[model samples]
Target chain A: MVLYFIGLGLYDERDITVKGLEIAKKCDYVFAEFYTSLMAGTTLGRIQKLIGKEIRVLSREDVELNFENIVLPLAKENDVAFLTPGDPLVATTHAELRIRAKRAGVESYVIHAPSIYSAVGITGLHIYMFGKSATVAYPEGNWFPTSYYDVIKENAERGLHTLLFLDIKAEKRMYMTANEAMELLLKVEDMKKGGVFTDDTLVVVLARAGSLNPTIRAGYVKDLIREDFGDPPHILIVPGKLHIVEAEYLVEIAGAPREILRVNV
Target chain B: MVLYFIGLGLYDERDITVKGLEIAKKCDYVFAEFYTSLMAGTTLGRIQKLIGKEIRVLSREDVELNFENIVLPLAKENDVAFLTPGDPLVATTHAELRIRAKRAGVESYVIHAPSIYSAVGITGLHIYMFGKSATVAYPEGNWFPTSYYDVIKENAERGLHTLLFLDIKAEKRMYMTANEAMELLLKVEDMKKGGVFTDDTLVVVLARAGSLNPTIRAGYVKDLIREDFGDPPHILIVPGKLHIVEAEYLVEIAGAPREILRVNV
Candidate 1:
């Protein structure tokens, strides 16, 4: 009579924790949704093979609208697991689902895994220097989202880094590349003239995090906008004034411009 | 010819990912450090038993000074793993260690696991709303650290939550509790006269994260300063302008004051 919210971590099936895998295997029913983010390194078949269970994949509508009716009902009678990419509660709506479970008298627990939120640490940036995070969305029919640009402005004004999550259209199997996100930012920069994201702006791109040879690149937007980072699931970072150690690491590890050690530091 | 930096996740031995465990078992040498943060749920002996390796525990000096001498030398000919409590590179200095490995002609790969950075999602706070994080250190004889106070003030001014990582003395086996952290913040407020943290400031405490039944509580400093949050490794969050759903989750799951739904929300 309980529910388990398990995170499948970033990139692959093997990223799931031993504890999460054990609990998920023992659950009477296992349901997962991948619309929030994609695991670029593995597929449903690989995950199912690892856990030795048939996972019922749910769409966004199935989860957002019918979670109470579908998942909660099973939780009241047997142990159920709801798997999501990255940490489960990192999505604001998923946190609210716990309230629904409580209302339905269904106990719930969380089993965490690695998230891109912390995986960015691999890019040689200080995690504590990051400020409020924002997401870049593909422009819909007449609506262009610029709030994410403003978030970078606000964070940069305070000498803090901004973590920009690239958008994804999972149903169409489309993932936003870091180059596309930078191009969108440039368009927004031209309209707003806020100087938040210009071609000259220094940015970092992390592609396919959690993979052994994932690309970590740092340079001005002008050079990186056309540079190939390889594959899907890329995130962008705009750093403020850099510490000397941060600058040195970028130059040595990320192949950032050597001039940044003196200029951005 | 490779060095692997792996995170053991939060809390216990089993928190390591299935991939991390599999790789760690095959490594030629396994080295770990506990000074950054300790897993409250398990010990070195237990972790060694699970990984089937003779784990060598490192000190802060051993890692920061002699990491190349000890670990990278072995990586030149065989697979070597450097394990950490949380995400490997989140320690700020560890990310630079990859540079050292590169200078020594050894390639490095990062295997991520759960970290307190994402584990904070368990508190039901929106992850994107978090701002620049800070560490609260113990006050020395003539030097009292108050920079953490300014971080909270700056984040709160922008209506962003601040994540405060409490100080720890792993060698001495001492951890700063949420109550002690609150008391120190109050003392800092008296000196700075900033009114950033007072007795009435709403705060959230999370203890023993990565465990199934962690202690999560949210309330005014007045009420929580004397409350028992169980064991060590506690993190405190000073929220700024809570969303109604966030406030509701605190009340429902963390046993926070119901009045916050109207006031802080």
Candidate 2:
């Protein structure tokens, strides 16, 4: 009896790797949670049909409160799988699940998959140049948070790009767009006066990253703030000093402003 | 008519997503390069056979100097796929190739796959806490580079983990082990006296990621510098302060030293 942690990858059901899919097909019971990230490209039925298994959905409470009580008991005699969007244990508290399996006398294995963190490379920013990733959360009910702004400022000062994961409320079906993220950062700037994100600050927006026709746009926030990026699951990047080649890619492929070709160096 | 940048995932052919593999199968022309990484779990012939296409191997000069002439020329009328190890454009210079495809009037799309940058999450270290990635390069004659040491220092000062990509000489089929990376860091520390990497410093080694049975080890440098990590394509991580949960996972799953369970934060 063993437990498997499988990642469903970035977007669709097909985003699962062949190895993960094969293992999922053979698992006695398949469990998944989508609270951390939404799969905009596919649905649970599609994923279940593809893997030839009925996927039992777990709520955030179900996972955090008593995942072992629900899943590990089945794992004592049957192979159980825990599926998650993106890579398992990334941005999610599932890494601790492996420890639970060990304590329950169940051996566990992890299968890798594509994640938005790695998928950001498609935006043409060098991955090595990225520093200190942060999430842009929707400020709620008198609790104002703006740590993501400081992350961008620190990364910018170090001449490194900052990756911002937008807020998502999947149950409410409310996804924070790049526009909303921009407005929030602007609000933070007005309060903190860090000058980290401004109307003139160049930001890259990636919408529907795993999709073939993902929208990649690079320009000043003022111009792109109101621009359409299409749908949800968007990612915002605040780039620091760009290399000439990165600037050229932004200009030619991403349709960045031609003036951006003037590298600071 | 189109060019596809497909990533071969991390360890094996099976690491590629079902979507990427299905698209690669239908592509009229397939080209690949292995200089960026070595797929330790599978070989070129297996991948070629899986796709049912002949994969033309390209060298660094062929890809860097004139990718448009070699790969994009066929993409003018045919669907061409250029496969590379891990996620395409994550670490390698293949990102500029997209610009070349545009210049050649060839449309391009990138298919995502598993990358070590994301795969490192298996080590139980939170991905969000990771800051600034660097590669440990082999010291050439008169070119002993130690910038990675500075990267660790900068990241640690901010209470963030640092991901160190061990050097890989794919031409000679030589992959730098995590042990060697630790040794290199120790040498740099000796010279600069930065005290960034020492015998007591905790480090995590992930070998042959993307494989189900990959080795995960976390311990002090003195305990792990001479430890065997099983195979090539190892990744090193120098963690900053650890959360209690993260420390627990490292101790339980990664075989980290028992004392590591004592979290600073």
Candidate 3:
């Protein structure tokens, strides 16, 4: 029996690789995880309709508890696939599952696809300059975690770029927008007395990434906070250390004014 | 007049966002930069043929030199596209050109695409776990630079994962294979006398990422140095700190033995 873990990249249903599509089509049973990230324009129904496949959507708990029982047993009897948003195995849990499949002597394979890390390169940030990444979870009432500030601050001290993933609870249509995330950071700076993050800090916002009308913009956090970026599933990048070339890009591509950036002499 | 920087994601010509393809089709002139990365099974000729458009390929020198003359003026006069692999503007040079377009009063927009960063998520390694990244340059005359070594060592000390982009001299046929890069690292460990890296350090190798048939393997550096990971464009990951789940994943997914990893109880 064979099990395939496939990633559906970032955009619509057609964004999936031909190999992934072929496997999904042939698999007797398929399950998809849409909680971690959702396809903004592509819906499950649309995908199923287009691909002509019957997919059993799995809840977070279903995957956590009965992955082996429900999915593995089926895989053992016939080909099964676990479809994930973005690349299938980027999350640690998927890796564990792949390893477990091997241990159980179940034939397993992975179908790779495009991800957010690829977006950093698109923003003209040196791929090698990135450092420790962190997520910004939405603040509940007055309780926002200031850990992200420390993470970015430390990364900056080390002269590394930071990639920040914004939290999205897709089922509820609840997402921590980039503007709201920035406001939380400002509040964190105030509470922690961390003078490191300022309103002028260069922040890049990427919204609706992997979509046709994906948005990528750069500006001061405060200024960005005021603008309505218009959508969910956004990512914010607070650059730590900038090279001369990177600084130039911030001013050029992101609409970051030259007055705020340190240009090469 | 407007300039659009478009990213044609991984896989077939159809992989590009509908908007990106539409713009490319209608643009007065379309130019692409292909030296940074290459598609696995597709080529420039294939993409051009698929689109039914004659795309002007840009050399490194052309982009570095008269970018304004070649792209900007055309962009100002009519809609022009600076096309790239994966997500456009990920390269610093492309971002700078976007900024230039803005300053020249030429409207600009980016049509995003899938990228490699999201692939890390598929690996189940917490995105935050990664730290400062480095590239393995060609070992010139039996001497590999210790710069990459230092980056990995530093990330490990901080308990962060190091992403190693194996260098590519696009003009040369010698794409830095994962095995060759590991061998160079092994030599560096033998000579550096540094406590950060040892023969037994864990490393993860990614081959043909973003493709349908991508391969991932994790093992000790010394052991991995013996492997001949097939094809070009491979990435090496050296883990710094491991959460219990992460350790479990390393063993389970990538076939890393349980004996070598450190579990945080």
Candidate 4:
């Protein structure tokens, strides 16, 4: 039996690759892991309707719970696809399943799809200029964990662009809005003494990426939060050292704060 | 008049997004930047035919030299698209051009496409594991630059995954094969005394990503270099500070030499 781990990129049902679609159509059973990243403007029913297949939804715990009881037995018996939003394996959970599949002697295949990693290209930042990425979640009752802050600070210090993924819980129907994400950063700025981010730090916010009316806006952190960014699956970017051209792109295309930002590097 | 920077994702003309195709079709004139990266299987004539438009190919010099005289004027007069293979802004030169267009008071929009970024998703590496990216260029006259080495070294030092973009000169039809890129890095290892990469370093090679026949392999540097990866647009990943699960994925899915190469951080 072969298990295919497919990714459904960023948008609606159409974003799934032709190969991925073919795999889904041919598969006897299909399950999806949607907790890693939300499928903006897309629902499980919508996907199933579009693909002409019944896709069972798996919670985070279901996949992580005993592999032998659920995944292994099913995978051994028939062709199954454990699909996920964005690319599978971007999250650590999917990796666990794939490794288990290999251990169980199950033939596994990965079908790639478009994701936020590709979204960095929209900012005109060199894909090579980015460092290890991190998620910014809302502080838990005033004492925010500064883990993501340190990661972003260090990445910026090295002149690498930071792809800051804002936290979202689609199952609970909650997403950390871009405004809330910026506010959290501002709080981090107040707490941390000497990090790269400042009150006037230039940032780019992408909303509804992969949709027909995708939106991107650039400005100082404070101004960007106040700017109307439309919908969900938003991505925030804090660029580090700029090439003269990168700075120009921020100002020209992204509407970044021009006066305070300089070509220091 | 506005300029739309469109990305032609991996493979044939059909890979382009529906919106990007619509914009390209409706544009008064279309120009494509093919130097930074090129689609291997498809020819320029085929792409032109697919879009049903006469595409004007621009050299690196033509775009840079006639930025104002050509691009700016055309963009100001009519909606134009600066087409690129893969995501539009992955190259430094394109980033600069976008900035230049802004300075000239020409509005610009970006249409995203698939790239090697999604390869990380396929390999089960955590999205956050990646760090600042570097490229492996084929050196001339037996002279290799330390720049690529520096980029990888910095990422490793920070415990971030280094994404190595194999260089490509699509216009001249020059592509640096994965084996060739691995050979260049092996040479870099030889030149620098405290270099991050060695013969036994854990590396991931992704060949022909975003296609049905995508190939992913992980092994030691020497072993990977010896393996023949049959295609263009390959990416090499030198991972740093992996968790047990990430390590497992590399070992199971990509055949990584984890037993010999694991470095606990």
Candidate 5:
């Protein structure tokens, strides 16, 4: 009679909260989707072993279209858990699914976990300085998406940092690297001529967040546009005018250039 | 040789991630501070009992002033764990402590957990819609900080939501409630006369975020200024122009007025 929306935290099986894991263990059916974001650290088998239950892996179509037909029906009679990488509703359309559960007379609850939204704190940027976030996508045939560029521009104009979520193609197992996102942004800048994203713009790259040795780098795009940040699931941040303390943290902790402390601050 | 900064998630002892709990149990010393935020659903006794560690609680001054002398000293030879209520560095100055660890030749790692920053997703607003965050502080003697009001105004003008972290007096066991935050905002509005926050402003309240049955309410300030939102550690959200889906979710899940769907959207 209850449905739980559980979040599997940032990188691995151990990232799930004790409360989330406890409730997941008691559920009759557990369904999860990996299309939204990848857990680069662990496999599905490892997560299944942790919860002591068989997981029904779901696809994007399966969840967006037939969640009610598949999971909601079972949830009405027994406890069901729907799991997703990162915080449940952060980047997904799962919030509307809760509404669907209510219409079906099924009660739903959210059990949160660590998300990249907060994991960016590791990069030493004040979380409060972040503004509306955007995603960078691969430009298709004749269509191009430059809204992500505009989001950075808008946020920068207001002295707010912009968190850019790189695109992920789960079916092809392709995740956009921060380097690739910067290249795409450079191309977009060439076309839009907004001067919003350029080689001289200071950007921060966070790779494999939630991992102990995750990479945190900050510098001008010209210097770091091709520098390797190990693994997939990389995110880029374009900081607006930096506070003196923020600039110091970037230089001292994130390996940003010492000159940035004076220039950006 | 290692210092772990673990987050005890939103409201309870069980809200900690398995990774955090496992690491904390094996640590040589565990130090925590509750001055940043409160875990209303659990006590230090319960947390200590679960982790099997004798926790040394520090005050705000102890952390801000003497962290290098106290916590970092033990980290030079032992695996020391420093715990905080929310995600390790979200709203706290703990990020600078990492720099302190570096200065002391100790490695620091963060184990993130659920934070009210992301827990606000339960209020049914789109997470990415949130802009810069601010904290409402208690007005001492003659210093009435109205900058939080300006933050909401700036975010609202840009059609972005503002997350307001209410003040806490953890040592005195006092926490500013949502009602009190509203009253203070009204006072600031009276002083600033900037038309930022008023009785007619639409706001949302979330109380006891990590609890299974936390309160979620949404309405104009006039109607909710005196409404009880349950226990302490309440957060307020002043939404900007809402999207249709966001308004719908607020109405369906947070018990907001149905007219918001058409009006705010």
Candidate 6:
């Protein structure tokens, strides 16, 4: 018995690769989790007909709580598939879920697909310059996290760029917007007084990245903090030193102010 | 002119997601280069038929020097698609080429796919831990490139992962295999004696990624230097400090020596 951990890709059902789609069609059962991120362009019915199977959308509790008990029991006898937005293991616990799967004599394979990790290159930033990533979570229990603030501080000090993931799973479909992340970062700056994040900091905002018209905007936090970036999901970037070409791209493509060409480099 | 820079996935034509394939099919003209890299298991004609277009292949000169003339001229009113083996604008000159698109008054959009940059997640490594990336190059005229070696050292010192790309020349039929990279790093070690890459250094090799049976192996440099990764184009990784979960995947899934579960951490 075998299981396939497939990625439905970034935005919609159509984003699934032909190979991944073809394999899912042959599987005995298909189960998916959508808690990773919001995909605005797809409906379960659309993907079900494409793969020709009624997909079972698993709850966060189902995956985080009873994945082995619920999924592997089926995988032990059937060719089952586990689907996730973008790549399954990119931020999911599924990488180690395969360990419990192996203990049950179930074998699994991961099929690669488009991921935000690589799609960030669309921002015209050298993908290699990205350092350790972090999440900007809303203050829970009225307690804020300064970890993401420190990450930008660390990456910037190293002349590297920071890719900040906005937090979701607010017990509903709501997500922390890039605007929200920006404000929290400013607040953290005020507290720590690290001179890390300020209104003048140049940042990039990528929203609804997998869509045909995904938004890519770059500018100082002062200009972008209140700007509309469309939809809920968002990623914030705090860049360090800029290469001449990288500067030109941010200015030309992402609409960063030309002042960065003279100031940030 | 409307131009689409579409990236083919790692291995075969089926590696393309339906989102990219459907868009490419709707284009009026299609052109591509086998540069950036090549897919061993696929042919141009196969991709052409899949997308319902004739394949016009361009050389490095046609792209680097004459992209605006050859590609954008047709895009003035028609929708055109330019294909590359991996993600467009990544590991390629297409990023700069976008500037040319604007200079020609042609608008362009990048449709992404799975690249080695993101596909390395299959190695069970946390994608976020990846720091700056570098490519290993062959020594030419005794002027060796040691930046790749130094890049690994820098990231390792920061407890981050370094994704190493291999150098390739389609015309010369040149591809630097993982073995050659290992030897090059060792030679560089001899020059600086930085103890960056050593016989005992743990490394990971991913070959033919996106293939159904891509190779994922992790071990000491001494053991893997001459090991076969089963293909020409390979991605080598020199990882830094690891978490227990990361180590477990390397040992169990990638067939690393169990010692890594402790020592590599």
Q: Which ranges of candidate 2 are over 4 A from the true structure?
A: A263-265
TM-score of 5: 0.98
Comparing 3 and 4 on lDDT, the stronger one: 4
Worst 10 residues of 1 chain A by lDDT: A86-95
CAPRI-style grade of the A/B interface in model 4: medium
Give the TM-score of candidate 3 (chain A). Answer: 0.92
Regions of candidate 5 where Cα sits further than 4 Å from its true position: none
Clashing pairs in 1: none
What residue runs in model 3 are displaced by over 4 Å at the alpha carbon? A11-30, A77-79, A100-106, A139-144, A263-265, B1-33, B38-57, B66-93, B100-114, B121-124, B139-145, B187-192, B211-213, B261-265
lDDT per residue (tens digit) for residues B45-127 in model 2: 99999899999999988898878778888999999999999999888878898888998899999999999999999999989
Candidate 6 scores a chain A TM-score of 0.97
What Cα-based lDDT does every candidate model obtain? Answer: 0.91, 0.91, 0.73, 0.75, 0.92, 0.86
List the candidate 4 regions with Cα displacement exceeding 4 Å: A22-30, A66-82, A103-105, A141-143, A260-265, B1-4, B12-14, B18-33, B41-58, B62-82, B96-108, B141-144, B258-265
* Model 6 alpha-carbon drift over 4 Å, by segment: A263-265
Instruction: Give one digit per residue, the lDDT tens place, for model 5 in A1-265.
Output: 8999999999899999999999999999999999988899999999999999999999999989998999999999999999999898888888999999999999999899998889998888899999999999998899889999999999999999999999999777689999999999999999999999998899999988887778899999999998999887799999998988788788988899998887887
Could you tell me the fnat of model 4? Answer: 0.61
Candidate 2: clashing pairs of residues: none
> Per-residue lDDT tens digits of candidate 3, residues B117-164?
556554556766888777788877866577988998888878888877
> What is candidate 3's lDDT per residue for A1-265, written digit by digit as tens?
8998877767677656555776788888888888777877688998787558878888877777767877888888898888887766663366667766766678887766566766556566777678888888877798766678888888888877778888788677577888888888888888887676778677888777666466668877767888878787788887766777777776666566675455221
Model 5 gets an lDDT of: 0.92
Which candidate order results from sorting by TM-score in descending order?
1, 5, 2, 6, 4, 3
- For each of the candidates, the C-alpha root-mean-square deviation to the true structure, in angstroms, is 1.0, 1.1, 3.7, 3.5, 1.1, 1.5
- Candidate closer to the true structure by TM-score (higher is better), 4 or 6: 6
- In candidate 2, the second chain superimposes onto the true chain B with a TM-score of 0.98
TM-score of each: 0.99, 0.98, 0.85, 0.86, 0.98, 0.97
lDDT of 2 at A48: 94
Q: Residue by residue across B115-223, what tens digits does model 4's lDDT show?
A: 6666556766776888877778767686656698888888888887888787876666888877887777777777786668888788888877766567778888777
Residue A98, model 6, lDDT: 74
